Design a protein around this ligand. Structure first.
Ligand code: SF4
Ligand code: SF4
Ligand code: F3S
Ligand SMILES: [Mg+2]
Lengths: 267, 534
């Protein structure tokens, strides 16, 4: 699947919705074809790989044990309740899979709030005992770079990977192990509606003339003030982001946001 | 030289989510099958007690492939519960975003999930690019030259010669495979378009972000309508329209001709993976409270009796748990649903999946593009009839051909073509409405303390329904019944095989170590296991 030449990536899917994988497919300059043909060697990825079953399992083994080393990118939380049985691949629990593979990686990137912090399945009452990667595997000394969001901006993944390949090290990380180059500012301090906030000019409802005029969404629940992400700067799909579409930020790059940021339409 | 014994495919790749397929093979043909879904998250449990307005944000995360669809279903469900009638422009904008989702989803499915079951990418290196160009220019109004295709071949050659095959590592076609039929030139055409589709899908997804904030996981729906005042502007409408136009051109000039060239080479696939019963909910309403106002209408068909389409009665849905990892054996209507996990391991107490088994009037129902297309055809849908008949005539097959894996795959293309054109119609209607002076996109509403609601979406994989019971103004019960639940769920308490299971019976397997034939059928249903299980 790999040898010399391009750096090997092993991409794992735990308890996830595949939205994080889809975000990577939206990569722009570079595009995903450049990334998998020129930049990297994508050596395991269940969503798009040709092999299935036993052949897929052999491809993973081949990649993980390569003397050339690999980077792991992980999507989804690890279900730990009931000895991990809520999530299995190839009839191995995800806990067991990640426990075996991730300590072998040269670097691990937890991609998306589920892998970083536990995410949607970790929300109360957390029936599957879903944990983020670093929480789940702290005892094995795994320290994944956390690229948060639901899903993250794929700019932030590519940027992290490129940095790592160049510098052979992680970039500066915040106290949630997120790169400060992407997560160092709140959404709010970058928001175009900030002057309305300052002026106490809030939309009271989505149907209101104030909402039509682009007033601040704080009264309607906006969690921009407490959310670290680069959304207003980079935008999504080269064209938009939630507040410019008229909807509050739901805080999706923060830990425990499903429970901390709810009810989403209140502040 | 025909195998007897089990075959397990775990993981089934090139799907969303975590699926294990088990079959029994007798003399080279499948005689039995199990569809085992091996991840549970429990979103229904998590939602209990929460603000109904929050449901769409959680349930959207059911799935990032069929992103937006669950936000739409939940918002339709809570709109319905509170009795709000959203403005015409909110219906148009929600419909336009949904149409764009179908185009993105089906293009990615055909190329990036399904096609490696049928295309030997490495055989493309032995192709004659001039012969390939002529072939490609004969099937499409888009003219392709030898140099065009040589560029792809050169890139692939470099990639393959590095020995780092990446996503093609251990592919079932490496070394040759008796079930892979295409000539080198047709492989090269399909491989070129696989690669092209990787960039085109960026634009198809962008179309959703124009009005919908971002893809994946849109953020423009609210109870009562939508939030995106900017979507009223001529600039955003122009931006959408341009992306839609380019996406439709790709559908028309690249995807459908490729679908037809591959289907013609695999015409034996008309003989495998048929199903008996079909359910569809309709999509693209004029009236959010009348399914029969939708461009595609709802319906139910039993045992392929398309002369006798039955009305869809939402009270005849029950979800079984007898062969699922939940407590007990009692099927429930989703307004009385239960999500009580109880794992017994594979086939423990005859249970083998985290999916429930939805049954309609006790029967297992295929849903998705084949259901939507066949039922619309049978209802006289003129656009569906026109495209379907042209596809049939081009392939030289009769309508019986559609009841198969090839049929299903063709139906996905048919629906893509029809929806790509209908997006233009919706767009114009939207423009017309704005021009009338209607600039309203959200309606006021009030939260009842007690209510029941349901929202229906016909998503790219079929009939999606979200069901709420509001108690004390909070979520008392929230149940998702998802298209892949219908199609890939397990057996019910009457032991009836699900559509996927039944469809697999009779599958030939040439090489049990490389069971691409099983993949062809399973992939034709476009499984989404995060969806099916939630
Ligand atoms: S972080 Fe969000 S988008 Fe990514 S896998 Fe989790 S639920 Fe899906
Ligand atoms: S809309 Fe949200 S992020 Fe923008 S100024 Fe208001 S509170 Fe801040
Ligand atoms: S909801 Fe998420 S995508 Fe950005 S605008 Fe808020 S952090
Ligand atoms: Mg359900």
């Amino acid at each position: 699947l790999m040898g010399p030449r391009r750096p090997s990536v092993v991409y794992l899917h735990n308890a996830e919705c595949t939205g994080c994988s889809e975000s990577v497919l939206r990569a722009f300059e570079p595009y995903i074809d450049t990334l998998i043909l020129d930049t990297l060697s994508l050596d395991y990825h269940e969503t798009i790989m040709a092999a299935a079953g036993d052949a897929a399992e052999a491809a993973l083994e081949q990649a993980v044990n390569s003397p050339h080393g690999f980077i792991a990118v992980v999507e989804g939380g690890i279900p730990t309740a009931a000895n991990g049985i809520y999530g299995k691949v190839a009839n191995h629990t995800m806990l067991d899979i990640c426990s075996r593979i991730l300590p072998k990686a040269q670097a691990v990137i937890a991609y998306g709030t589920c892998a970083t912090f536990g995410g949607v399945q970790a929300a109360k009452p957390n029936p599957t005992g879903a944990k983020g990667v670093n929480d789940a595997l702290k005892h094995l000394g795994v320290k994944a770079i956390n690229i948060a969001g639901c899903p993250p901006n794929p700019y932030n993944l590519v940027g992290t990977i490129v940095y790592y390949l160049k510098n052979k090290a992680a970039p500066e990380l915040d106290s949630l192990n997120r790169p400060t180059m992407f997560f160092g500012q709140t959404v709010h301090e970058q928001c175009p509606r900030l002057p309305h906030f300052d002026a106490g000019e809030f939309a009271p409802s989505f149907e209101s003339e104030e909402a039509r005029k682009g007033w601040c969404l704080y009264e309607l629940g906006c969690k921009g003030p407490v959310t670290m992400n680069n959304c207003p700067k980079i935008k999504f799909n080269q064209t938009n982001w939630p507040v410019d579409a008229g909807h509050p930020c739901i805080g999706c790059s923060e830990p425990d946001f499903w429970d901390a940021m709810t009810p989403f339409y209140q502040n | 030289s025909s195998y007897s014994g089990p075959i397990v495919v775990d993981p089934v790749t090139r799907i969303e989510g975590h699926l294990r397929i088990e079959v029994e093979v007798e003399n080279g043909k499948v005689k039995n099958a199990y569809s085992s879904s091996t991840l549970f998250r429990g979103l229904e449990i998590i939602l209990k007690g929460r603000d109904p307005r929050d449901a769409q944000h959680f349930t959207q995360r059911t799935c990032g492939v069929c992103t937006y669809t669950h936000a739409l279903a939940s918002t339709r469900c809570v709109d319905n519960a509170v009795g709000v009638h959203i403005p015409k422009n909110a219906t148009y904008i929600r419909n336009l975003v949904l149409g764009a989702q179908y185009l993105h989803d089906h293009i990615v499915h055909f190329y990036h999930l399904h096609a490696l079951d049928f295309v030997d990418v490495t055989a493309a290196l032995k192709a004659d690019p001039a012969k390939a160009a002529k072939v490609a220019s004969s099937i499409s109004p888009r003219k392709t030259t030898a140099a065009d295709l040589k560029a792809v071949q050169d890139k692939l050659k470099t990639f393959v010669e590095t020995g780092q095959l990446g996503p093609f590592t251990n592919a079932y076609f490496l070394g040759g495979h008796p079930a892979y039929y295409l000539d080198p030139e047709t492989n090269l055409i399909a491989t070129a378009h696989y690669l092209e589709a990787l960039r085109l899908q960026v634009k198809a997804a962008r179309a959703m972000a124009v009005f919908g904030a971002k893809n994946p996981h849109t953020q423009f729906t609210v109870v009562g309508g939508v939030t995106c005042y900017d979507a009223l502007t001529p600039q955003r409408i122009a931006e959408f329209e341009a992306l839609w136009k380019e996406t439709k051109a790709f559908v028309d000039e690249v995807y459908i001709p490729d679908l037809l060239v591959v289907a013609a080479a695999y015409k034996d696939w008309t003989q495998y993976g048929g199903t008996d019963n079909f359910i569809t909910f309709g999509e693209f309403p004029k009236d959010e409270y009348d399914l029969n106002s939708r461009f595609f209408k709802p319906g139910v068909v039993f045992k392929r009796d398309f002369k006798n389409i039955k009305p869809f009665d939402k009270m005849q849905i029950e979800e079984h748990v007898r062969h699922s990892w939940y407590e007990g054996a009692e099927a429930r209507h989703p307004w009385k649903g239960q999500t009580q996990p109880k794992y017994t391991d594979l086939h423990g107490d005859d249970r083998y999946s985290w999916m429930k088994a939805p049954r309609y009037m006790g029967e297992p129902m295929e849903t998705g593009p084949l259901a939507q297309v066949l039922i619309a055809y049978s209802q006289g849908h003129p656009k569906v009839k026109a495209v379907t008949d042209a596809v049939l005539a081009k392939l030289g097959v009769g309508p019986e051909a559609l009841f198969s894996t090839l049929g299903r795959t063709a139906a996905r293309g048919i629906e893509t073509a029809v929806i790509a054109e209908y997006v233009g119609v919706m767009l114009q209607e939207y423009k017309d409405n704005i021009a009338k002076g209607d600039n309203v996109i959200c309606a006021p509403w009030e939260m009842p303390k007690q209510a029941e609601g349901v929202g229906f979406v016909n998503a790219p994989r079929g009939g999606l329904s979200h069901w709420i019971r509001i108690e004390d103004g909070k979520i008392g019960n929230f149940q998702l019944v998802v298209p892949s639940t219908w199609t890939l769920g397990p057996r019910c308490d009457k032991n009836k095989l699900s559509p996927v299971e039944a469809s697999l019976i009779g599958t030939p397997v040439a090489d049990a170590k490389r069971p691409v034939e099983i993949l062809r059928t399973v992939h034709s249903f476009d499984p989404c296991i995060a969806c099916g299980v939630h």
